[PDB]
Symmetry: C4
Subunit: 90 residues, 4 copies
Amino acid sequence: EFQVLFVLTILTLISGTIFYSTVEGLRPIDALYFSVVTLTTVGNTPPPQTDFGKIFTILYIFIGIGLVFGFIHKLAVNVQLPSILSNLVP
Amino acid sequence: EFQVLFVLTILTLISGTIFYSTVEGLRPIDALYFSVVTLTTVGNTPPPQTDFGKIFTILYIFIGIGLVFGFIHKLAVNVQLPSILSNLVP
Amino acid sequence: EFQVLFVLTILTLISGTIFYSTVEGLRPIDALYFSVVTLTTVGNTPPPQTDFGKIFTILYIFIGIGLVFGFIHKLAVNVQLPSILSNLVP
Amino acid sequence: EFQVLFVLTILTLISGTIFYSTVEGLRPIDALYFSVVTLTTVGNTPPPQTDFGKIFTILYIFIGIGLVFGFIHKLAVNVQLPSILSNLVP
Ligand SMILES: [K+]
Ligand SMILES: [K+]
Ligand SMILES: [K+]
Ligand SMILES: [K+]
Ligand SMILES: [K+]
């Protein structure tokens, strides 16, 4: 489960990195950062400058938000939870 | 279910597109982009400039956020999930 | 239930409106707008300029986010849902 | 439960405060503010300026969002709810 969500999230982020670095002309790290803060809904950046960028972003959000949060709802629920929970056992 | 949420989400976005293009003077694509990133809570844009725009946005968020996320909670749960899940069966 | 969440959300927004108009010097409508997009996590505005504003915002988010979304999870689930659901009955 | 989430959230915020004040050169209060609005997904600030800041932020979001919202889903569900609910009993 977690491994699958891990991979699916990775692929989604790779696609965004490739897209924004090419169409919005961002350095790869900035393209990855934009993809991440957009899909996690933080959105602490300016918006895309091109219409292609805006259209892709709209579709990218609808298709990737569900997945990204599914992975997060497992990274801290089936991985980070035990680490602390089980450890809270004297 | 999914088809209904699909339509409801579309209508909500059409209303926002019409509103922001008219009152905030945005090109249709920018009005749609603003509507989408606002309802999905990404918010990676400047805020509306007019009071009419601010008031509408407040009401638009409260009435459309629930719906938009309901659609997302189906687009990747009852459509994208099977595609990958069932496919994960050798 | 809905009526209570309605009132609780209103009081929370009134407090934010009063606070930001006074400490950040915003016009009431802008103070309300900031309160709303902050608690719904859209965040499509610049951040507070004063330290008092930043500290209050931190506390305001932690105490009001749960409530605001609880109200939203009722405004479209126990009010908007029936309107469309029941109506989807020929 | 609540006490644990309380502590875990505190530690996460302390780490962010230390990181952003050092690497992004922010005053402690601004570093704390950035950490808070980023993990709660409000994101009403400009993004980090350094690559180190961007990379850390990506990891910080994935590891801290689940926790922060878990705490919020308890601060208003097992603490703020009773205060109002039980009080709604004449
Ligand atoms: K958000
Ligand atoms: K934002
Ligand atoms: K911004
Ligand atoms: K923003
Ligand atoms: K946001």
